[PDB]
Design a protein around this ligand. Structure first.
Ligand code: RCR
Length: 167
C-alpha cells in the first residue's frame, strides 16, 4: 500500500491521473519524482520549468553543478539528484525532443531508466513541448516500465483521450 490517491489503474503496474505533477509531488512527497529533462538540465519550461520553479530554483542550482562536473546527459539517459521540497529524489530523464529531430526510438531507452526505481511519480516522457504523441508515449511506458509508475497528466482533455484510447 502506498499514498497515491485517485489514480485509474491501466495495467498491473501503471496508474494514471489528471493532475499537476508539482501539486501531486508536494502532497505525496514520493521517493522519486521524474523530471522531463534535457541533456543540459536547463529547466526552462514544460514539466521541468514547473518543477524547478516549485523548488525556488534550487533544482537549477544543483543541476548546474552536476553539469559542470559531469557534462551533459545522453538522450535516453538519466541522473538521480535531490528531490528538494518535492520528493526524496528527482530522476531527471531525457526523452527525445521531436522538435530537435531526435530519434523517437530513444523513447524506450528513456523509459528503461524507470526500472531502476520500485515506485515513481512521472510525466509522460517526450510529451508536451518535447513534441511526441502522448498516446505513443503511454504505449511505450506500459510496454517498457515494469516497476510501479504513477503518471500525472496535466491536461484534462488529454487525460480523457489517453484513457479512452488505451488498449
Ligand atoms: O512540458 C510539456 O509540454 C508537458 F506536456 C507538461 N508536463 C506536465 N506533466 C505533469 N504535470 C505537469 N504540471 C505542469 C505545470 C506546468 Br506550469 C507546466 C507543465 C506541467 C506538467 C508533461 C509534459 C512534459 C513532458 C510532456
Amino acid at each position: 500500500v502506498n499514498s497515491f490517491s485517485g489514480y485509474l489503474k491501466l495495467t498491473d503496474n501503471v496508474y494514471i491521473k489528471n493532475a499537476d505533477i508539482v501539486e501531486e509531488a508536494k502532497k505525496v512527497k514520493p521517493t522519486v519524482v521524474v523530471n522531463a529533462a534535457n541533456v543540459y538540465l536547463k529547466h526552462g519550461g514544460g514539466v521541468a520549468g514547473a518543477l524547478n520553479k516549485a523548488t525556488n530554483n534550487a533544482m537549477q542550482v544543483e543541476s548546474d553543478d552536476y553539469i559542470a562536473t559531469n557534462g551533459p546527459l545522453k538522450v535516453g539517459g538519466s541522473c538521480v539528484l535531490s528531490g528538494h521540497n518535492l520528493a526524496k529524489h528527482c530522476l531527471h530523464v531525457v526523452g527525445p525532443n521531436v522538435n530537435k529531430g531526435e530519434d523517437i526510438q530513444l523513447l524506450k531507452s528513456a523509459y528503461e531508466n524507470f526500472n531502476q526505481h520500485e515506485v515513481l511519480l512521472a510525466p509522460l516522457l517526450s510529451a508536451g513541448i518535447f513534441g511526441a504523441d502522448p498516446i505513443h508515449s503511454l504505449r511505450v511506458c506500459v510496454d517498457t516500465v515494469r516497476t510501479n509508475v504513477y503518471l500525472a497528466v496535466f491536461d484534462k482533455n488529454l487525460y480523457d483521450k489517453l484513457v479512452s484510447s488505451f488498449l
